[PDB]
């Protein structure tokens, strides 16, 4: 398994937290590139607003 | 939908512009900004 | 056993067992990779396990 730099969410302008709708997903920093993965299997993809 | 690169052959073959006829309310904002 | 390959197609058309398994993987975690790197590994591993 990989070591993943997870974030609890994004807080835009210091006011608006946004978090992934689905609890089974991890938002993480791939050396500055934000990506989303399953908590079970490392199958990463880019985030969309609809997440 | 979710975005995944790759295009593993057996996919609807379509341009970004034509996409709005497959997914209603899709907006190509970049093209739009170039026109407006 | 035939139910493993008689995937949900018209007629009584079957699918490759490789596909059947891919579906059973997506069930667990939606797969984001077009190419099945995992299948040759798992087929080989499976074959050893059965032997
Ligand atoms: C959607 O458009 C793509 C891109 O034009 C088409 O996929 C490509 O189709 C050709 C025909 O299906 C593939 O066959 C190739 O033929 C040459 C002989 O002319 C041969 O040397 C190559 O080995 C090969 O088999 C090509 O690989 C393939 N594209 C992909 C991604 O594999 C695809 O046909 C169109 N999609 C659909 C659903 O038809
Ligand atoms: C899309 O618009 C942004 C805003 O005008 C501009 O930075 C970007 O380069 C445009 N992208 C494309 C692909 O034309």
Swiss-Prot record, chain B:
PTM info: Glycosylated by host with heterogeneous N-linked glycans protruding from the trimer surface. Highly glycosylated by host, occluding many regions across the surface of the protein.
Glycan-modified residues: 8, 13, 30
Localization per Swiss-Prot or TrEMBL: Virion membrane; Host endoplasmic reticulum-Golgi intermediate compartment membrane
Superkingdom field: Viruses
Entry remark concerning the domains of this protein: The KxHxx motif seems to function as an ER retrieval signal.
Family recorded in the similarity comment: Belongs to the alphacoronaviruses spike protein family.
Protein name: Spike glycoprotein
Gene assigned in the entry: S
Span within the parent record: 1189 to 1224 of 1356
């Amino acid at each position: 398994y990989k070591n993943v730099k997870a974030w609890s969410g994004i807080c835009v302008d210091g006011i608006y937290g946004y978090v992934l709708r689905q609890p089974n997903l991890v938002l993480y920093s791939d050396n500055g590139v934000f990506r989303v993965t399953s908590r079970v299997m490392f199958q990463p993809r880019l985030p969309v607003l609809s997440d | 939908f979710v975005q995944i690169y790759n295009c593993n052959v057996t996919f609807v073959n379509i341009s970004r512009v034509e996409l709005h006829t497959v997914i209603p309310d899709y907006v190509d904002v970049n093209k739009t900004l170039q026109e407006f | 056993i035939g139910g493993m390959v008689l995937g949900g197609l018209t007629s009584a058309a079957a699918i490759p067992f490789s596909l059947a398994l891919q579906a059973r993987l997506n069930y667990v975690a939606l797969q984001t990779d077009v190419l099945q790197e995992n299948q040759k590994i798992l087929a080989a591993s499976f074959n050893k396990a059965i032997n």
